[PDB]
Design a binder for this molecule. Sequence first.
Ligand code: 4YT
Length: 113
Amino acid sequence: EMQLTPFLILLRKTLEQLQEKDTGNIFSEPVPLSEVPDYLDHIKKPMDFFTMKQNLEAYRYLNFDDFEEDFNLIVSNCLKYNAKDTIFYRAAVRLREQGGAVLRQARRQAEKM
Ligand SMILES: CCc1nnc2cc(C)c3ccc(OC)cc3n12
């Protein structure tokens, strides 16, 4: 029950804030299927920040949950595919942790709309 333009402005800002937490840029683009030939074997829906940006601008995120769901996919896919003693796994835990406050604050603002 809100206006489209301010909401998308809020999602854009939120997405940039989330991306800022990924300092190694390991989640910026789709996992390279050419480099990881077995990836799709147990990852049913790959996700990444570039794809999220495309979805946002394609008006595919019209509520906060659908945005947050794809962010959570970035994290959960990474935890699933990689062993716990890897940099990738711990980077996903860190993103989940730091992304948490970013999402909570952004949703607060959305609920004012
Ligand atoms: C989030 C990126 C990712 N998640 N799991 C893996 C596993 C692998 C193997 C992987 C390899 C290269 C790479 O460049 C971004 C990302 C990779 N990766």
